[PDB]
Design a protein around this motif. Sequence first.
Motif, PDB file in Angstrom:
ATOM      1  N   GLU A   1       3.998  -5.038   0.021  1.00  0.00           N
ATOM      2  CA  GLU A   1       3.266  -3.846  -0.406  1.00  0.00           C
ATOM      3  C   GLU A   1       1.833  -4.179  -0.815  1.00  0.00           C
ATOM      4  O   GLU A   1       0.909  -3.407  -0.530  1.00  0.00           O
ATOM      5  N   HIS A   2       1.631  -5.337  -1.445  1.00  0.00           N
ATOM      6  CA  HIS A   2       0.272  -5.747  -1.751  1.00  0.00           C
ATOM      7  C   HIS A   2      -0.466  -5.915  -0.426  1.00  0.00           C
ATOM      8  O   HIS A   2      -1.540  -5.326  -0.224  1.00  0.00           O
ATOM      9  N   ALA A   3       0.166  -6.616   0.524  1.00  0.00           N
ATOM     10  CA  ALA A   3      -0.465  -6.875   1.797  1.00  0.00           C
ATOM     11  C   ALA A   3      -0.876  -5.590   2.470  1.00  0.00           C
ATOM     12  O   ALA A   3      -1.968  -5.506   3.024  1.00  0.00           O
ATOM     13  N   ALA A   4      -0.033  -4.559   2.373  1.00  0.00           N
ATOM     14  CA  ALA A   4      -0.374  -3.282   2.961  1.00  0.00           C
ATOM     15  C   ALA A   4      -1.646  -2.735   2.331  1.00  0.00           C
ATOM     16  O   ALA A   4      -2.518  -2.242   3.046  1.00  0.00           O
ATOM     17  N   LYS A   5      -1.832  -2.887   1.015  1.00  0.00           N
ATOM     18  CA  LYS A   5      -3.063  -2.342   0.439  1.00  0.00           C
ATOM     19  C   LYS A   5      -4.294  -3.037   1.011  1.00  0.00           C
ATOM     20  O   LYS A   5      -5.313  -2.396   1.302  1.00  0.00           O
ATOM     21  N   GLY A   6      -4.181  -4.348   1.194  1.00  0.00           N
ATOM     22  CA  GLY A   6      -5.257  -5.146   1.764  1.00  0.00           C
ATOM     23  C   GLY A   6      -5.577  -4.679   3.178  1.00  0.00           C
ATOM     24  O   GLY A   6      -6.745  -4.461   3.529  1.00  0.00           O
ATOM     25  N   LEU A   7      -4.520  -4.504   3.975  1.00  0.00           N
ATOM     26  CA  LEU A   7      -4.647  -4.096   5.367  1.00  0.00           C
ATOM     27  C   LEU A   7      -5.255  -2.690   5.439  1.00  0.00           C
ATOM     28  O   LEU A   7      -6.139  -2.435   6.257  1.00  0.00           O
TER      29      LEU A   7
END
Lengths: 53, 53, 53
Positions: A1-7
């Motif tokens: 989910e963190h990665a999704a925010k970055g993406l």
Amino acid sequence: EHAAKGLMNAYENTQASESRIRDADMAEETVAFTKNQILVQSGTAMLAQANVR
Amino acid sequence: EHAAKGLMNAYENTQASESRIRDADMAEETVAFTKNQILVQSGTAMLAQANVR
Amino acid sequence: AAINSHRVLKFQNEEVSKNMEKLSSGMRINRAGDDASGLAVSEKMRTQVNGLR
């Protein structure tokens, strides 16, 4: 989910990048249109007068 | 338990700090929107008239 | 000679243009050219408005 925010941040910014690279400001292009259309009309008229010479 | 009360007071105050640093008053920012949107609309209309010149 | 109307025509085209400058921005003053001191004062007011916030 963190990665999704970055993406998602990169995504929004990349899409803004495409718009900034490709998408024109219609207001200024419209100004250009009007100038060029007037010059076309002026062209035609002066050839009509040039024919008189 | 005493320490927790101390930490809780600092906590509430620190949370006020984040809000005071970051959170805007929606009423005034909305006012700004209304002024700015009107100015956009005025822009569009005057360029349409400027084109007539 | 062209009568004064060619003065009027160019000058009025300019007055039309200036009128548009004001209307689109919402302002009597868009430039120092409209009112250099009204501007200089408003720039001071801007540091006061933003400075105060």
